[model samples]
Target: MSEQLTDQVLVERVQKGDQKAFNLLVVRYQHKVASLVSRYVPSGDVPDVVQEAFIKAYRALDSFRGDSAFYTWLYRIAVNTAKNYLVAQGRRLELVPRGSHHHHHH
Candidate 1:
């Protein structure tokens, strides 16, 4: 039950580099973003993912479209950042076998 603001207003304020407005956006979405990221990452890394996502979202605020909810745009970025983080850590989830599973067997 967070106080929801119009995406247009939020986007405008953010586009102008309004720190308070950006902070409001973060407060409103942090929980939701953290919850979504937790599904793919471990609990211990959830906070890190959330932080990285917000930083990215803020830096990319100019790219947001008023046609979509601000949260929706941010969500996609957050998910992608988390996925990239996993890949960088060499912990990325494998979708297909590289060649064989023999090397993984003990």
Candidate 2:
């Protein structure tokens, strides 16, 4: 039987070595992260940037503490990753720094 889980539950499962739970989290947050990336990066770069965020978040899942909510933590990763992507592509938005606020008007 399968269990429908909340993000905290999913994160718990992931911390306990459940990749499937994290996969579920991916499906849940994919579009959210994508939309967020779109606000900064060009549409062409959104997919790669979002994927990079997910990858980085997944890699560090074991160390994740469900304190500020899963999406909050994931959002941090995505924003930082997107900023890095912008830097890598030579697009500079002098408004904010990497790992800073998520308010992007570019």
Candidate number with greatest lDDT: 2
Model 2 lDDT tens row, 1-106: 7656688788888888878888878988999989887887888888998889988999887887658688878888988988787675454444567675534433
User: Scored by Cα lDDT, where does model 2 land?
Assistant: 0.80
lDDT of each: 0.78, 0.80
Report how far off residue 23 is in candidate 1 (Å).
0.7
The estimated TM-scores of all candidates read 0.75, 0.76
Task: Give the lDDT of residue 80 in candidate 1.
Answer: 93
The parts of candidate 1 lying over 4 Å away from their true place are 1-4, 91-106
What is the C-alpha local distance difference test score of candidate 1?
Answer: 0.78
Q: C-alpha displacement of 104 in model 1, angstroms?
A: 12
Q: List pairs with backbone clashes in candidate 1.
A: none
Task: Itemize residue pairs with steric clashes in candidate 2.
Answer: none
